[PDB]
A paper describes a structure:
Notum is a carboxylesterase that suppresses Wnt signaling through deacylation of an essential palmitoleate group on Wnt proteins. Notum is a negative regulator of the Wnt signaling pathway. It is a secreted protein that functions as a carboxylesterase, removing a palmitoleate ester from a conserved serine residue in Wnt proteins that is essential for its binding and activation of the cell surface coreceptors. The structure of Notum has a clearly defined lipophilic pocket adjacent to the catalytic triad that accommodates a C16-lipid palmitoleate group of Wnt.
Exploration of the substituents on the aryl ring that binds in the palmitoleate pocket of Notum gave potent early lead 7y (IC50 9.5 nM) and further optimization of the triazole group delivered 8l (IC50 6.7 nM). So far, all changes to the C4 substituent had been unfavorable, then, somewhat unexpected, potent inhibition of Notum activity was entirely recovered by removal of the substituent as unsubstituted triazole 8l (IC50 6.7 nM) was the most potent inhibitor prepared in this series. The Notum-8l X-ray structure is consistent with the ligand retaining the H-bond between N3 of the triazole and the backbone of Trp128. The near optimal filling of the pocket is achieved while still positioning the triazole in a favorable position for a hydrogen bond with the backbone of Trp128. Triazole 8l restored Wnt signaling in the presence of Notum (EC50 110 nM) in a cell-based TCF/LEF reporter assay confirming functional activity. Assessment in broader off-target and safety pharmacology screens showed 8l to be selective against serine hydrolases, kinases, and representative drug targets. In summary, triazole 8l (ARUK3001185) is a potent and selective inhibitor of Notum activity with good brain penetration suitable for oral dosing in rodent models of disease.
Author numbering: 88 to 277, 279, 284 to 351, 355 to 419, 427 to 452
The structure:
Amino acid sequence: DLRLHLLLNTSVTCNDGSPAGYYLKESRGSRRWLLFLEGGWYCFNRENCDSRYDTMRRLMSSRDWPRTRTGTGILSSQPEENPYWWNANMVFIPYCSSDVWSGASSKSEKNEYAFMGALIIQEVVRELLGRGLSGAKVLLLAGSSAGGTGVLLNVDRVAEQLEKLGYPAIQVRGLADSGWFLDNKQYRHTCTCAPTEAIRRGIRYWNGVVPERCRRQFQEGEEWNCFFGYKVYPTLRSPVFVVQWLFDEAQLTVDNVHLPVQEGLRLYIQNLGRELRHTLKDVPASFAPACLSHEIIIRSHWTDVQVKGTSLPRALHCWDRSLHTPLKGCPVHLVDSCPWPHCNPSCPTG
Ligand SMILES: FC(F)(F)c1c(Cl)ccc(-n2ccnn2)c1Cl
Ligand SMILES: *[C@@H]1O[C@H](CO)[C@@H](O)[C@H](O)[C@H]1NC(C)=O
């Protein structure tokens, strides 16, 4: 249902210099726009990016992209699959920059790869304005995994971009799914590169950019801190809803945890969930189930998980209402308190 458009500005490119793009399904009677950032890890040096180019080329190039994609989960146009925003204008932005959506660097005589994630988002927004986005009332920038961190890094820049283009009435909001990570100690030490070390190397290789207020706090050489949700979120002005499994599989991977569990690992896992829960305590719009999993919002069965009896599509609807005092029976802060994966019976089965 979503049709591919390669960017008209062919200077905004995937890693290999092929044009970036977006998949679009318009909904002509709607002023809601959902722009979804795909995830898919990252690469932080020539050797690891070369390997990714061999066996994950669609994440580095548009040369082999299909002409259409089916919208699923929050990108579905069927109310049965998407109770939240089924009638919205739907945009899926493929992740082909390997930079957690942070890069602003072209391929050149000094750069084998272009890392243009931050510029891809800006260019998609610019080109959509002529396709109906100029009439929008709400632009929800959503994303999963690396795309979820991409929301945190870019939501306020989209807001600033629309303001400077003369569209102050479009309300820009963010939905960060599975992009809220902890710069914690690994369970066993290995660069499965530790989260702190991975981002420090990548940001230099990508010429990565972070939100301005966060950059002003951490300053030169320390911008890697702004890739961590609990540090960047308090600096953001746009409303951001945070979805994060308490025992996220990507978090455990970078922590070198691989799953009978003995005391040391049991304590490690329980402490991880408690730390994640703590970082969400003052995030008013959040959905954090006690599950071992990764991503949720574009899965066809994303409607199934509940926290305290409330599904994610319901919580997002309650968030919409809150952005028109708490709402009777329409909660927006939903964080599990039970301390072990699958202590929530609605967790994905696998
Ligand atoms: F390492 C880390 F720091 F925890 C981190 C960050 Cl900041 C942002 C995105 C990812 N990620 C996971 C899967 N795709 N991207 C990770 Cl794993
Ligand atoms: C194309 O994108 C580049 C990089 O974002 C930008 O500098 C340039 O102004 C863009 N060109 C047009 C015509 O928008």
